[PDB]
């Protein structure tokens, strides 16, 4: 079972138990147990989220090669059937649903497996083996081996996290899309490179939404 470097030691708690344990924590954060668990949970959160986000961005930019997803937050850049909706109502619905489901999984963390039953249809209850695995109905095909399964999961998830951040920075700098930037490096690899594109970013500097102008940002003083 390898470590993250030829000729290095793994700290004790990074033993080889959590999927994708390469024994790496140079900043020593896996010291207290509860903190370690909370962090693992947030890691699952970020991994699965960034996976979703790359999946989205990619699929949309492909099927509609005109979106510039970075703008997909256009109150006007909204599909026909629901195209110019009241942000008030939208945010209302969204915030409410997320507060609910998030507090549910938070209670899960607080006491593992204590809200498995459906608090209305109590003839419904989810079998959760481990912290952050609802399973059961949360896994309809229920393929759960399971070890190498979770390892694959965390591996590709970290891949997704870094990939999404890279996409976003490419957008900020060159204002182009991912496929656009790749096709450009195809046009010329020497051209269309961050050396040329760096030192400036494509921010629209706090666009004005229906109500007001939300302060926008660049990730560094390139301008």
């Amino acid at each position: 079972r390898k470590l993250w470097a030829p000729g290095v030691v793994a700290p004790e708690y990074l033993k080889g138990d959590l999927a994708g344990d390469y024994g790496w924590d140079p900043l020593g954060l896996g010291a207290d147990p509860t903190a370690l668990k909370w962090y693992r949970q947030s890691e699952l959160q970020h991994a699965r989220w960034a996976m979703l986000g790359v999946a989205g961005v990619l699929v949309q930019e492909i099927v509609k090669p005109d979106v510039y997803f970075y703008e997909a937050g256009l109150p006007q850049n909204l599909p026909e059937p629901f195209t110019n909706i009241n942000m008030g109502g939208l945010l209302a619905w969204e915030f409410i649903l997320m507060h609910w489901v998030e507090v549910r999984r938070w209670q899960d963390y607080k006491n593992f497996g204590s809200v498995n039953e459906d608090p209305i249809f109590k003839g419904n209850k989810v079998p959760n083996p481990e912290m952050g695995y609802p399973g059961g109905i949360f896994d309809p095909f229920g393929f759960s081996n399971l070890k190498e399964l979770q390892t694959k999961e965390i591996k590709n998830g970290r891949l997704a996290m870094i990939a999404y951040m890279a996409f976003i920075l490419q957008a900020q700098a060159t204002g182009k899309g991912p496929l656009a930037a790749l096709s450009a490096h195809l046009s010329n690899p020497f051209g269309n490179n961050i050396l040329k594109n760096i030192g400036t970013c494509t921010v629209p500097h706090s666009v004005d939404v229906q109500g007001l102008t939300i302060p926008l940002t660049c990730l560094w003083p390139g301008s």
Partner: protein, 202 residues
């Protein structure tokens, strides 16, 4: 201990009847600190000159080093996303933290990984020796595999650090006398080993 040559013609490392700051522990500690600094400082003082000589960077940057703002009379640069003073302030606070906690370590050894510090204490336990706490970060890679290699590395560090102190003094004296850039002096003495010299600079 590392890098000694028996050379102390003034003889201050004498460990007897010592006190105050004159104590080999603190003295060699200051030496290694200066070594690491001077190394960083030399790398910096040079980098942008050659970096713009090769033209890889926009000529907007690569001004001579003594003009980046440290001495406005020596010329100032602008374009920084904030003011020199507004940056100087956060610089004050960050260096206050780092230096103060390193000092608390050296004064009360091991006692700087105890107060709750967001879990950022196990690394600050380090060794019982300043300038060499090691630990997971300060020795990121487990370097010093053979302890012979470890002493070898300490020797090389002190060597390069003393070289760096000398080089930094060189940069100072050249930039004051000839007023040009360091790589400038290099290009010149290259062009004329004889007619580009402090003899010529008289």
């Amino acid at each position: 201990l590392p890098g000694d040559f028996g050379f102390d013609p003034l003889g201050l490392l004498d460990p007897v009847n010592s006190g105050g700051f004159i104590e080999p522990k603190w003295l060699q500690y200051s030496e290694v600190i200066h070594a690491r600094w001077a190394m960083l400082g030399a790398a910096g003082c040079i980098a942008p000159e050659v970096l713009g000589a090769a033209g890889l960077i926009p000529d907007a940057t690569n001004i001579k080093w003594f003009e980046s703002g440290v001495i406005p009379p020596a010329g100032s640069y602008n374009g920084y996303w904030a003011d020199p003073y507004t940056i100087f302030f956060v610089e004050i606070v960050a260096m206050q933290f780092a230096e103060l906690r390193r000092l608390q370590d050296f004064r009360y050894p091991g006692s700087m990984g105890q107060q709750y510090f967001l879990g950022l204490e196990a690394i600050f336990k380090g060794s019982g020796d300043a300038a060499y706490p090691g630990g997971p970060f300060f020795n990121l890679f487990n370097l010093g595999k053979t302890e012979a290699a470890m002493k070898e590395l300490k020797l090389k560090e002190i060597k390069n650090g003393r070289l760096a102190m000398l080089a930094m003094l060189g940069y100072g004296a050249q930039a004051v006398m000839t007023g040009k850039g360091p790589f400038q002096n290099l290009v010149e003495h290259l062009a004329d080993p004889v007619n580009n010299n402090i003899l010529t600079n008289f």
